[PDB]
Design a protein around this ligand. Structure first.
Ligand code: PRO
Length: 172
């Protein structure tokens, strides 16, 4: 069945750098896709954390060259935070989709069954994450914008400048 389309407009050090367009796999992982969709639109308002359940304004706090760009921590901004629309953590829905190449959209976590709002966009094939992170979508436009963000990461994960999701939402 159906697939939602969502976007991020990115700034890097405040400079507009383009739009990333993502297709979600609502047909394979509807609960996982649906959480991410709602966090793009902001439609579930204020969460248990007291902060908006919305990626807008948040950053890619962890970026690793030749690996992936990671965001979604809109409560702590640093990898410790994030909150799903379901309330904090939800189980791994399935591992039907794999990490096959750059562009893959997958959930960051802290171990089995700990999905929140943190996610990553792969800049390479990361087969070693298969069966441990739930893949729920892929980039279909703006992979160049993904690369631009990637150039600001470091081996340590720390970005050299703020890569921000200046706007986001759903297209259809
Ligand atoms: O941040 C990390 O290193 C792992 C791989 C991406 C999701 N969690």
């Amino acid at each position: 069945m159906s697939r939602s389309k969502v976007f991020f407009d990115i700034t890097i050090g405040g400079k507009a750098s383009g739009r990333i367009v993502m297709e979600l796999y609502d047909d394979v992982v509807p609960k996982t896709a649906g959480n991410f969709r709602a966090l793009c639109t902001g439609e579930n308002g204020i969460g248990k954390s007291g902060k908006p359940l919305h990626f807008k304004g948040s950053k890619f706090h962890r970026i690793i060259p030749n690996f992936m760009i990671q965001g979604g921590d809109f409560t702590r901004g640093n990898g410790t935070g994030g909150e799903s629309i379901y309330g904090e953590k939800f189980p791994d829905e399935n591992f039907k989709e794999k990490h096959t190449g750059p562009g893959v959209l997958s959930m960051a976590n802290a171990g089995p069954n700990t999905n929140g709002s943190q996610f990553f966009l792969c800049t390479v094939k990361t087969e070693w994450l298969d069966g441990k992170h739930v893949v729920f979508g892929r980039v279909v436009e703006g992979l160049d914008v993904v690369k631009a963000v990637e150039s600001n990461g470091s081996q340590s994960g720390k970005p050299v400048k703020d890569c921000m999701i200046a706007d986001c939402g759903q297209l259809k």
